[PDB]
Symmetry: D2
Subunit: 120 residues, 4 copies
């Protein structure tokens, strides 16, 4: 299932629990950027997915503030869990930094992360 410890292609660590109420809760540790140790995450997932072979839709957010550092930014991952020989969560993400209005055009990075239960 979704609950577990996952790693993305850069070796970030995503520790998540899927609640029966559709909640995702856990911690995220980033292999990149202005980040140190674990950050709180929260999200949601479809707790009654289609039974037709489709993946399970989900998303979560990390705001990049913890007790050590504050990057004044937040990442949301939107994606789906794909059950499988090798279970995977395939996502695309948006990383918005707090900016002045003049710099808002350059506030948001986009990318795609794939997570499995094995570290690269």
């Amino acid at each position: 299932g979704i609950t577990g410890t996952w790693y993305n292609q850069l070796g970030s660590t995503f520790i998540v629990t899927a609640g029966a109420d559709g909640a995702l809760t856990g911690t995220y540790e980033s292999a990149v950027g202005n980040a140190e140790s674990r950050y709180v995450l929260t999200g949601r997932y479809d707790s009654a997915p289609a039974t037709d072979g489709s993946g399970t839709a989900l998303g979560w957010t990390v705001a990049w503030k913890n007790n050590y550092r504050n990057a004044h930014s937040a990442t949301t991952w939107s994606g789906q869990y794909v059950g499988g020989a090798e279970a995977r969560i395939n996502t695309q993400w948006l990383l918005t930094s707090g900016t002045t209005e003049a710099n808002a055009w350059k506030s948001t990075l986009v990318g795609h992360d794939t997570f499995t239960k094995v570290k690269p």
Copy 2:
């Protein structure tokens, strides 16, 4: 400045509480605001933003399942809160639907939402 009710450009409404712990909790719904249009939201925000005039980074997720409906999808909004005389939350979003692998190319919509404290 974030806690309360916000309205997007399209008719949607959300009500959120910004907790002291950096949490965002609430519900997302339609203009009409009927029970069947209401979904849990959860997210995170920067609870200690920069003091140089930058916005406040935040993000949240809604999975489009409630006790009545299930669209097998989830949206994440990633953006920033701008305070001042015309307060706004400016976002970009990713809506991922659960798909088969063959259809994963058409799984993810992208767009933008601007939220205000007053109705459009």
Copy 3:
């Protein structure tokens, strides 16, 4: 139609010609209007759109190199032209900068530009 001089919400100037073959050609520049901030663009558009009221899909690219400056980056805009008494081109864009592999996570900005034939 599409051929003409457009401006985005930030004052950039998009001078484009829509050819009979689906080609878009022209130049993209900044508000100041100077040679050093002017760049070549090329793209494509649907030369036979639907007749049901839908917009006309289009996209184009600017590589941020000209005879004076090189930012080692390129932007693509993807969107549609909406006809009527206020013609508009609504777009989302991706701006990729050349990076090392280690920095590829932070290579791509995303945003949205709306273009009209009037200045903002």
Copy 4:
């Protein structure tokens, strides 16, 4: 290193010439290799990239109209070319369909393609 034939990870091919003026021209074949599935592409690239291990920024567009078919849509790919023994073009894409204003929310898909010089 850009000019030539490239293959994505899902059975598409394209064929591009990278002109000394920074033009990309060519054809994109959504399948392999029937003419009903071939479309014009044009774009731009950084014709003077860094030789510091950074990728070469580029982008291109395909409008999904040819002599056989018309999906009333256009994709733009934004990315970077990475040279060497195992050369790649790493992209993120936006696929916008022409829509009515009421449907504009669901107009734009996002995703990622990775192209290699060898077939997958």
